[PDB]
Amino acid sequence: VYRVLQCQEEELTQMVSTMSDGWKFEQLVSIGSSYNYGNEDQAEFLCVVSKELHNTPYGTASEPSEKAKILQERGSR
Amino acid sequence: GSVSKWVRLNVGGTYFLTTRQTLCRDPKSFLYRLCQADPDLDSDKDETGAYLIDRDPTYFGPVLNYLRHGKLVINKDLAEEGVLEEAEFYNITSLIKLVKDKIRERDSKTSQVPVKHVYRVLQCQEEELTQMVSTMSDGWKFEQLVSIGSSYNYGNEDQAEFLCVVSKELHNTPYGTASEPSEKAKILQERGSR
Amino acid sequence: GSVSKWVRLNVGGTYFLTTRQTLCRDPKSFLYRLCQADPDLDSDKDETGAYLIDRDPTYFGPVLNYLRHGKLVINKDLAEEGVLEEAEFYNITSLIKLVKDKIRERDSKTSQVPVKHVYRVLQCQEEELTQMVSTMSDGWKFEQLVSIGSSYNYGNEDQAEFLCVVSKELHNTPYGTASEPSEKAKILQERGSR
Amino acid sequence: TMDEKYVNSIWDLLKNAIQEIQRKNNSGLSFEELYRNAYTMVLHKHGEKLYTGLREVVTEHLINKVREDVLNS
Amino acid sequence: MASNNTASIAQARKLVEQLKMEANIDRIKVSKAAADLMAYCEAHAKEDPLLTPVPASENPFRE
Amino acid sequence: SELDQLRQEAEQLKNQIRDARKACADATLSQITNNIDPVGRIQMRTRRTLRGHLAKIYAMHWGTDSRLLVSASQDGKLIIWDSYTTNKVHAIPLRSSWVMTCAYAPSGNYVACGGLDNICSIYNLKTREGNVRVSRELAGHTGYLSCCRFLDDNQIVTSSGDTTCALWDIETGQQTTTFTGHTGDVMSLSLAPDTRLFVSGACDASAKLWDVREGMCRQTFTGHESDINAICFFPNGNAFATGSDDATCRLFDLRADQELMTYSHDNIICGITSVSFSKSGRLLLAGYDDFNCNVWDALKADRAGVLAGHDNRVSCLGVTDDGMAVATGSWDSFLKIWN
Amino acid sequence: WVMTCAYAPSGNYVACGGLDNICSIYNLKTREGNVRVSRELAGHTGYL
């Protein structure tokens, strides 16, 4: 499972040093901005991280819930 | 022999020449009732007096080590699942518990999170880069290098030029997480957070 | 077989036919006393006139190899811990220490801080890039290629335009480290450090 | 699981055989037996138990046999 | 131990000792030590570069 | 039981000790005399800006050569700055996290560190294979390593949590001489230039001075009402200042066995988080929880000067081992060299 | 798809949950120095 952590240069070492157990850091990219390139602003890095799971022998599925589907529809738009 | 100081067992057709006391190590073992000379015994080599047992010589070995020197050590070619099977068959409850514990640690490692990688962000300018990569500490792996745009000097010629993410694995998951309480450490952590 | 100048010993139920001095190599051992005349002994096979000695032949193998030629041997199917405990029972302290160090090496090469891996930063511009990438040496693994930001010579060209970080795993444990006393080496290291 | 049930039995047999060899009984016991019993008990962290038991067994074997003979001499 | 109030007797004994070898050490006069330390400071004033606006090329942080 | 007489003896001995100290308490000459050289205004400028740290820097410790300064950040990163060229001689990522102490060897051949991981790591900088290989991982402490210092390449003192500063033998990977005299967890540790007596500051506010070869608490100075942050010996080894969570710094004298001087002002009120002595010892520079740090005359406690650098607390101080310059480690990740 | 974020009354834990019928409770402050999963509340057959 993969997640994107938007960060700026400052707290970067803070979060990278403080990744949770089982979470493998995968990649880090910079990003420009209207002011300069990134830094001097927020939103200067995207940190893509991953976590290994174990559900292959046990399978994966969605346990039924009608309100869950309603909320998924609401969050899709 | 039927009765002797030493016993000539026959596991899967292979003769184990051991001593009575190794089998008599504990009385909750299948082998203890096997050793005794009592009714309900018709499976033995009647040409030499060897007890012919229908069990594998593969998983009998590590189990026999448990009664020979108090500990079971599995081979690199025999599954700990097989020795668990054999211990459960011989009803060696302590051995069953120990092999279960070993299997629990092994499966906690193998199923997911065998290790918990730790990650660090070195900050290197281009000039020193190669050297501190070359002299980068043993047991750490390079994972990423990223430049940074700067108004000080865009691209090259920067003293914060490169951010090097390195990492290393950590064996704390198969051994279990460790932590102890201390209030001074917690208040210092709170100071550091702000 | 007979027990004589060449001795026939029944380990695990299997006979090893070895030489008297080979076992008499070092006193610190279970087998030293067995080599000597013993009226203290009672569990010996009188059916073939051989000493029935308890302990698996598999882990007794490397012990016998050591006791013949002073060095242990670890198979890829045999447990290092098994020959370790074989050394424990037979009590050869030097062999115990050696097999303990072998287990230490096996664990350290697989430990949370490995001994392997070593990293270099080659530098090339686009023109020579594919050259040193393709010709890059065997056993080395390419790790990452980075460009560099540039305010000098805009367009795809610079004298440090690409940095190629490569690496390779190491096998430092058998060869051994190069860290040993040499004062001139220390002087050179200090001079190059600053 | 409790395991001293056989540890006590092997300890008493071990002390009996030590008394027997001190008695100069040699064709009634196996040196490998006592060897392995001692190693077993060491591996279950009884070193103080082994040491004290050896001390006491050799002590009363001095008392019960040697002292009477020396006094008679 | 617990019968001796959880070995607080050890704590009290330890304090008594530390006070004993504190007493065994003679205290020197405050004026004496102050004079000694200011004498050290003044005799070492010229050899402390922090007390000196050294020339342009005198120290390896501006030289 | 046995406690009553022992505690009564403790009370009477404390009274006797106070009486002895006040009996030898004389008038302090230093603050009285103003005819002895007044410091005057000292305008001071930083020369280097060792940017390159990312987390808050906890401890910084000059090397023996007074050129290589090791600094530890909050994230578990050691930077061995070449103080002349702002060059990372080495950057060591540490297995542990939340390190607060960085101990330089007395030969510049090792670096030791300690954090909330409750383990003291000794790393050999001089591994002949180039890379900084780990030397030892000393474990067995009762808590986090507040601070540690090298006495020898095989002898270290690790002021761990829960009132312990056990002297560790690096060679055997075994501790040698536990020091158990505090009631609050040790928070600082300073070696005398004599390197035979170490003063340990804790959260019991009592700076316990320990003989390093016997395992006994030589002396016990007090006067701070707050936990001791950092201790820095005088260049003599017979006196040392002490800073605590209060804005007060107390210069104690070993021979006098009582507080020689005090150092506090009403303009700034913040815990003294770092204390330093110059080569002469006449200057006492203290880093504050307030972002700036202040240097007083170590003899009149009047303002020698104020260093208006940084924007965060000066988390650590260190003077060169010839007192030519002073490095101010900070929490805004900019170590500043002052000279 | 988490839509709840429960902050502890001490800043010592954080709880969250969503369309997984499991409440994740995390210890922010750990002697290991990093955020860790502390408890996975399972037992709801509906989304938290």
Q: What is the 3-state secondary structure (H, E, C) of B14-81?
A: EEEEEEHHHHCCCCCCHHHHHHCCCCCCCCCECCCCEEEECCCHHHHHHHHHHHHHCCCCCCCCCCHH
Resolution of the structure in the document, Å = 3.8
In contact, F298 and F339? CB cutoff 8 Å: no
Give the residue on B whose Cα is nearest the Cα of D9: B25
Residues 163-192 of B with CB under 8 A from C: 168-172
Distances (CA, A) of F234 to C139, E28, F59, F159: 56, 17, 19, 20
- Quick one: tokens of F216? 């006994």
Q: What is the secondary structure of C53-100 as a DSSP string?
A: E-S-HHHHHHHHHHHHHS-----SSS-HHHHHHHHHHHT-HHHHHHHH
Has domain E4-63 been given CATH number 3.50.50.60? no
d(CA B35, CA B51): 8
Q: Please give the Cα distance from C105 to B115 (Å, whole number).
A: 19
The dihedral formed by the CA atoms of B102, B104, B110 and B115, expressed in degrees to the nearest 10: -90
Two structure tokens written together for G30: 């750990």
Residues B91, B94, B97: CA angle, nearest 5 degrees? 95
C-alpha distances in Å from residue D27, one per residue of B1, C32, D33, F104: 20, 20, 13, 68
Q: Is residue F28 helix, strand or coil?
A: coil
Q: How far apart are CA A42 and CA A34, in angstroms?
A: 11
The pair of three-digit structure tokens given for residue F270, joined into one six-digit string:
């913040």
Give the pair of three-digit tokens for residue F203.
């959260």
Report the CATH number that the domain containing residue F139 is assigned in CATH: 2.130.10.10
Q: Which helix (H) or strand (E) holds E62?
A: none
Whole-number CA gyration radius for chain B? 30
Q: What is the 3-state secondary structure (H, E, C) of F180-210?
A: CCCCCCECCCEECCCCCEEEECECCCCEEEE
User: What is the sign, positive or negative, of the torsion defined by CA atoms of B9, B12, B14, B16?
Assistant: negative
Chain F residues in contact with E52 (beta carbon < 8 A)? none
Rounded distance between C-alpha atoms, residue C53 and residue B119, angstroms: 53
Give chains near D: 3+ CB pairs under 8 A: B, C
G30 to chain F nearest CA, in Å? 9
Distance between CA atoms of residues G32 and B179, nearest Å: 7
| Domain interval for residue F94 | 1-339
Chain C CB contacts of F127 below 8 Å: 177, 179
What is the Cα gyration radius of chain C? Answer: 28
Contacting residues of F for G31, CB less than 8 Å apart: 116-118
Residue C187, amino acid: I
Residue type, D55: R
Give the Cα-Cα-Cα angle G40, G44, G45 (nearest 5 degrees): 130
- Which helix (H) or strand (E) segment holds residue G3: the answer is strand G2-7
Residue type, D25: N
Chains A and D touch (3+ CB pairs under 8 A): no
Is G47 close to A65, i.e. CB distance below 8 A?
Answer: yes
- Cα–Cα dist G15/G23, whole Å: 7
Please count the structural domains in chain F: 1
Specify the 3-state DSSP secondary structure of C187: helix
- Residue F127, classed as helix, strand or coil, is coil
Per DSSP, helices labelled H in B70-144 are 80-89, 93-111, 126-134
CA gap B99, B105 in Å, rounded: 10
Residue C56's nearest CA partner among C32, C86, C28, C78 is: C86
Q: How many CB atoms lie within 10 A of CB G9?
A: 7
3-state DSSP assignment of residue B85: helix
Which of E60, F274, F181 is CA-nearest to residue C194?
E60
**Inter-chain touch G32–F115, beta carbons under 8 Å:** no
AA letter at G6? A
Go through F210-249 and write b for each residue having 16 or more CB atoms within 10 A of its CB, e for each that does not.
bbbeeeebbbbbbebeebbbbbbbbbbebbbbbbbbbbbb
Say whether A19 and G34 touch across the interface (CB within 8 A).
Answer: yes
Decide if E56 touches F, using CB distance below 8 A.
no
Backbone angles phi, psi at B13, to 5 degrees: 90, -5
Closest CA to C165 of F12, B145, F104, F156: B145
Between CA C151 and CA C160 the distance in angstroms is 12
The rounded distance, in Å, linking the Cα atoms of B87 and B98 is 10
* C10: contact with B, CB 8 A cutoff: yes
Distance in angstroms (rounded) separating the CA atoms of residues C139 and A33:
42
H-run or E-run covering C173? helix C172-175
E45: amino acid identity, one letter? A
**H/E stretch holding B140:** none
Phi, psi of F115 (to 5 degrees): -145, -165
- The residue type found at D24 is K
Q: Which of F178, F127, F180, F187 is nearest to F157 (CA)?
A: F178
Task: Retrieve residue A73's tokens.
Answer: 């529809």
- Check CB contact of B148 with chain A, cutoff 8 Å: yes
What is the count of residue pairs from C and D with beta carbons less than 8 Å apart? 29
Query: Could you give the CA distance from residue F121 to residue F142 in angstroms, rounded to a whole number?
Result: 16
- Partners of F133 in beta bridges: F124
Q: How far apart are CA F91 and CA F75, in angstroms?
A: 12
Question: What are the sequence ranges of the domains in chain E?
Answer: 4-63
Closest partner CB to D30 (pick from C33, C42, C89): C42
| Residue G31 touches chain F, beta carbons under 8 Å | yes
F92 CB neighbours in chain B (<8 A) are: 137
Buried b (16+ CB within 10 A) or exposed e, F287-314: bbbbbbbbbbbbbbbebbbbbebbebbb
Structure-derived torsion over alpha carbons of residues F219, F225, F226, F227, reported in degrees to the nearest 10: 20
Amino acid at E55: P
For strand G22-27 and strand G13-18, is the pairing parallel, antiparallel, or unpaired? Answer: antiparallel
Residue F53: partners with Cβ closer than 8 Å, 6 or more residues away: B123, F71, F73, F77, F79, F333, F334, F335
Say how many CB pairs under 8 Å bridge E and F: 171
Q: Kindly state whether B71 is in contact with chain C, defined as any CB-CB distance less than 8 angstroms.
A: yes
**Positive or negative CA dihedral for C68, C74, C77, C81?**
positive
Neighbors of chain G with 3 or more C-beta pairs under 8 Å? A, B, F
Residue C105 — φ and ψ, nearest 5°? Answer: -65, -45
Q: Chain B: nearest CA to A69, how far in angstroms?
A: 30
Is the CB of G1 less than 8 angstroms away from the CB of A21?
no
Chain C positions in Cβ-Cβ contact with residue F67 (cut-off 8 Å): 194
CB C72 within 8 Å of CB B128? no
Q: How far is CA C128 from CA B129, C20, C122, C131, G14, in A?
A: 21, 68, 11, 5, 53
Cβ neighbours for C164, distance < 8 A, ≥ 6 positions apart: C121, C122, C123, C124, C129, C132, C133, C142, C144, C145
Neighbours of B, requiring at least 3 CB pairs below 8 Å, are: A, C, D, F, G
How far apart (Å, rounded) are the C-alpha atoms in residues F137 and F123?
9
Structure tokens at B23: 């089998």
CB contact under 8 A, B26 and D33: no
Is residue C42 a contact partner of residue D34, using CB atoms and an 8 Å limit? Answer: no
Separation between Cα atoms, residue E61 and residue F326, nearest integer Å:
11
The whole-angstrom separation of Cα F207 and Cα F227 is 9
Cβ neighbours of G29 in B, within 8 Å? 186, 189-190
d(CA F17, CA F179): 22
Helix crossing, D31-43 with C80-90: angle to 10°? 120
Q: Which residue of D has its CA nearest to C29?
A: D35
Q: Which of G31, G35, G36, G40 to mutate to test the interface with B (most CBs of B within 10 A)?
A: G31
Q: How was this structure determined?
A: cryo-EM
